[PDB]
Design a protein around this nucleic acid. Structure first.
Ligand SMILES: Nc1ccn([C@@H]2CS[C@H](COP(=O)(O)OP(=O)(O)OP(=O)(O)O)O2)c(=O)n1
Ligand SMILES: [Mg+2]
Lengths: 391, 549
DNA sequence: GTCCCTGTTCGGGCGCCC
DNA sequence: GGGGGCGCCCGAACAGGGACTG
């Protein structure tokens, strides 16, 4: 018997257009769907169902098996309404427990909101439309409805393994331990056996502090860059000051003129360097608000990011370095940053991506390996903040 | 005959009720066509006579078809359409001959009186009430004019063909409305056997396939094309030849050209498209600018030539090559073997107040990639008129993520290039200009000006300006009054943001003037400083331009 | 706050298909 | 004098960030 589910008040279901898919992905999708249809989990539907949600498919690692991925972000926004110890574990392992959901049927009056459409190559046919009969992978209702059954499956494993932390987020199960790798892995395989029957390291993660140049001669240009940087940074760290450094710039000087640093300007630069090695004071994570992530391209495979909920109130600031394909690296960056957020606060950030919308949409699903998909928006990075978080 | 297919259940939108819109006068000729049609349909159950139980009514007319021998009965359901529920359209796009693979055997079938062979939801029939002026009827089948008719037809058709598709996986059926292209790798005898099986399958579900519209030999007429065995051709495109052109007639002209550009390389519509700018209505007459009438002529010459396209071979590579046509115009040719186009096309969309050729190229590449994926389900390899190192410089100095798929350089001018390059470090022996501008939001008066480290200063008063403008003007002034090498310090994220993205084109005349200057210079270094923080001598020029505003 | 400027969406013509 | 699809171009509406008023 089914758990009634509803939409938030005054919201209609998703009506998002399916985007074009490669031949590979359509073949995988058609193969997957016909068998899901043969198991009763999805049903063919017509066009009188006015709702829709995009689908695609990712193939994993070195495998020859694809995974369907319904982009349920809109439906999740409209669907009716966390272990702190997870972020310490030496190893964290992430398993895909999405298959579990197809054991629970889905509320009849809600099924129509899960509609999706399979495209054909060169539009040989009209789209083929399906809807779900069971808890769909990637819907936010799915882990909720199935939670009670989930607790009951882990219960023996958890009891017998008290120092293993198991966390669930959507289709994912995060499993952390302080075990030696090998004992950890032997444990993970213990749980898969356990589940069948029915690598992360959040230590390594480190903050990327704001940096100040150090050098033996400064030009007017050097100092102008510095004062501008510090002025911005004072919005984050109110203890930054720039009066002495700025009085070295009195007059109308050539950019390449060399300015010897006075005692106090040397001093003030010394404080600032230390005021920067403090934690941002007064930042309290609030679950009623979205995590927001900004990413700036620093070049050379280097990417800087900050996570915050209110301007200049960072929860984390970090770096992502890589080996060249910007769009791939960016897509990888976004997955790593989301991963960290789920592990640290149990939520998914909203991304401000420094890329053109068509550029991103044309390629991001070639590099996507997660079972969830974060909200995002596209923005043109003002070239200034690129300088501020610079290496 | 009417299909024994299950009807598709349909509702009015809530709180709403069927149309009560009154029949309109009708030609004597049309009325006979209608009665002739209606007594036939009525006889066959397609429509049922209704009485005064039926309050509703919607207007009907008729237009003559291509066959120039039969009428098409239409209903202006515009009112019922608004009150009818939403559908999710299942037609996702238009098939293209360039995506067809070579087939040993080919058939094109049309379904006869297709709509009228698919039953309409019984509880919904009442709202389709119509009056044939000198009888009152309702529809029992899909009406031509109702908005649910296409998706319900296309969807019904897909259900009907699915058993056959499953049973015959290696027969290819391109299905556009009621029109079927059937391809097979069978010899003509065995293929004809499968066609008959497909027609019996269709007939069982009430869909007829009249021999009259059954094509058995090349060239096949399909989707506005002629399909020959090793090449396809677009059916001839005839451009108008007026002397007085209206908006409506520019708009119809641009359309045929855009349609044409799928196989005729080189087509351009910038100068024609720009005429449409600002106009009030379709009636309007516009005078062809001299560049417009010139452009029109080139296109005219292009269309006089003989052109065809080929079919797709999946065992070969997809190659796309792009040519710069100037002014944000691009053409491309997609092929697998040299000088045998699969298809062609153009990109000309103006995205952004300010941009440059490398960005525009990147957008063209992205448009082609998405289009290749629709038609062939894969990305092509590119041939682009841009040096590897031009690209590499851009990717190095642009603060955004950008990327072009696998590509190779072709030396076919005009090559895409960066027209100037801001310095990364300040310039020795270059005069340092501290620029600035202020404007009075109420009076709209402003000043732009600079101060230099060599003691020069200059203020220019402006009228009807904006703060951003004055800030761009100050930079233009420093550029105008400086040597071939100049250091400029600004406090404007606005100005700094435009100039640093290296545009070579802009909607803004002032930005264009700036660009012209940036191209003439040997070296420019543009630096930023926070405004109003006493930074000399941003501070000094700030007083000069603030004075009086 | 207001004003300015820039981007996106989206609806309106037209083209083509049925 | 009607419909649905895709495409193209355009302008209108609206969103979001920066600069400014005192
Ligand atoms: N302008 C048009 C053209 C077609 N249609 C719809 C979509 S396709 C369907 C075809 O109906 P018909 O069977 O009357 O097609 P035709 O008249 O093309 O050939 P016949 O088979 O001879 O009857 O009509 C429409 O609403 N408006
Ligand atoms: Mg027909």
């Amino acid at each position: 018997e089914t758990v009634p589910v509803k939409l938030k008040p005054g919201m209609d279901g998703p009506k998002v257009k399916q985007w074009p898919l490669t031949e590979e992905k359509i073949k995988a999708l058609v193969e997957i769907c016909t068998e899901m249809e043969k198991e009763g989990k999805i049903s063919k539907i017509g066009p009188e169902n006015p709702y829709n949600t995009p689908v695609f498919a990712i193939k994993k690692k070195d495998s020859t098996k694809w995974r369907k991925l319904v982009d349920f972000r809109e439906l999740n926004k409209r669907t009716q309404d966390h272990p702190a110890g997870l972020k310490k574990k030496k190893s964290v392992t992430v398993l895909d427990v999405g298959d579990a959901y197809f054991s629970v049927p889905l509320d009849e009056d809600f099924r129509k909101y899960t509609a999706f459409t399979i495209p054909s190559i060169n539009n040989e046919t009209p789209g083929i439309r399906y809807q779900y009969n069971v808890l769909p992978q990637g819907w936010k209702g799915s882990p909720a409805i199935f939670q009670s059954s989930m607790t009951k499956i882990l219960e023996p494993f958890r009891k017998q393994n008290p120092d293993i932390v198991i966390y669930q987020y959507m289709d994912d199960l995060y499993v952390g331990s302080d075990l030696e790798i090998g004992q950890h892995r032997t444990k993970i395989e213990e749980l898969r056996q356990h589940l069948l029957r029915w690598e992360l390291h959040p230590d390594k993660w480190t903050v990327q502090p704001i940096v100040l140049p150090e050098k033996d001669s400064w030009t007017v240009n050097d100092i102008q860059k510095l004062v501008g940087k510090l002025n911005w940074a004072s919005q984050i760290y109110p203890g930054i000051k720039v009066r002495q450094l700025s009085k070295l710039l009195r007059g109308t000087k050539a950019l390449t003129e060399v300015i010897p640093l006075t005692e106090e300007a040397e001093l003030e630069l010394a404080e600032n360097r230390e005021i920067l090695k403090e934690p941002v004071h007064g930042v309290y994570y609030d679950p009623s608000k979205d995590l927001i992530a900004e990413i700036q391209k620093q070049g050379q495979g280097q990417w800087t990011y900050q996570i915050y909920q209110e301007p200049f109130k960072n929860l984390k600031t970090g770096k992502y370095a890589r080996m060249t394909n910007d769009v791939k690296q960016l897509t990888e960056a976004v997955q790593k940053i989301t991963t960290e957020s789920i592990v640290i606060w149990g939520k998914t950030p909203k991304f401000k991506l420094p890329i053109q919308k068509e550029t991103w949409e044309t390629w991001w699903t070639e590099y996507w390996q997660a079972t969830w998909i974060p909200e995002w928006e596209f923005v043109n990075t003002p070239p200034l903040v690129k300088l501020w978080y610079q290496l | 005959p009417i299909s024994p297919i299950e009807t598709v259940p349909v509702k009015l939108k809530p709180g709403m009720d069927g149309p009560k819109v009154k029949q309109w006068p009708l030609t004597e000729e049309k009325i006979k066509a209608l009665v002739e049609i209606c007594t036939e349909m009525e006889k066959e159950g397609k429509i049922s006579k209704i009485g005064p139980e039926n309050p509703y009514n919607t207007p009907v007319f008729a237009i003559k078809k291509k066959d120039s021998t039969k009428w098409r009965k239409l209903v202006d359901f515009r009112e019922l359409n608004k009150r009818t529920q939403d559908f999710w359209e299942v037609q996702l796009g238009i098939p293209h001959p360039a995506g067809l693979k070579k087939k040993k055997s080919v058939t094109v079938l049309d379904v006869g009186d297709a709509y009228f062979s698919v039953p309409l939801d019984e509880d919904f029939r009442k709202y389709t009430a119509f009056t044939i002026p000198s009888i009152r009827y309702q529809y029992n089948v899909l009406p031509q004019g109702w908005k649910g008719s296409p998706a319900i037809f296309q969807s019904s058709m897909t259900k009907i063909l699915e058993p056959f598709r499953k049973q015959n996986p290696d027969i290819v059926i391109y299905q556009y409305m009621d029109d079927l292209y059937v391809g097979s790798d069978l010899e003509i005898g065995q293929h004809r056997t499968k066609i008959e099986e497909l027609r019996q399958h269709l007939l069982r579900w009430g869909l007829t396939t009249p021999d009259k519209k059954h094509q058995k030999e090349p060239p096949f007429l399909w989707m506005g094309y002629e399909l020959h065995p090793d090449k396809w051709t677009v059916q001839p495109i005839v451009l108008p030849e007026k002397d007085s052109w209206t908006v409506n007639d520019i708009c119809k002209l641009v359309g045929k050209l855009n349609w044409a550009s799928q196989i005729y390389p080189g087509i351009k519509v910038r100068q024609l498209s720009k005429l449409l700018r600002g106009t009030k209505a379709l009636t309007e007459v516009i005078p062809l600018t001299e560049e417009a009438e010139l452009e029109l002529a080139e296109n005219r010459e292009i269309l006089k030539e003989p052109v065809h396209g080929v079919y797709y071979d999946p065992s070969k590579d997809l190659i796309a090559e792009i040519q710069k046509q100037g002014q944000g115009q691009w053409t491309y040719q997609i092929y697998q073997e040299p000088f045998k186009n699969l298809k062609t096309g153009k990109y000309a969309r103006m995205r952004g107040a300010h941009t440059n050729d490398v960005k525009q190229l990147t957008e063209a590449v992205q448009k082609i990639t998405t289009e290749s994926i629709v038609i062939w389900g894969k990305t092509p390899k590119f041939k682009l008129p841009i040096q590897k190192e031009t690209w590499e410089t851009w990717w190095t100095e642009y603060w955004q993520a950008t990327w072009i798929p696998e590509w190779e350089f072709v030396n076919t001018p005009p090559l895409v290039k960066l027209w100037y390059q801001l310095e990364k470090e300040p310039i020795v022996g270059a005069e340092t200009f501290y620029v600035d501008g202020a404007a009075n939001r109420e009076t709209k008066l402003g000043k732009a000006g600079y101060v230099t480290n060599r003691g020069r200063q200059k203020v220019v008063t402006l009228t009807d300006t904006t703060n951003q403008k004055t800030e761009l003007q100050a930079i233009y002034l420093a550029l105008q009054d400086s040597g071939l090498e100049v250091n400029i310090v600004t406090d404007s994220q606005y100005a700094l943001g435009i100039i640093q993205a290296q545009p070579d084109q802009s909607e803004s005349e002032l930005v264009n003037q700036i660009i012209e200057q940036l191209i003439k210079k040997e070296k420019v270094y543009l630096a930023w400083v926070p405004a109003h923080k006493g930074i000399g001598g941003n501070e000094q020029v700030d007083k000069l331009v603030s004075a009086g505003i």
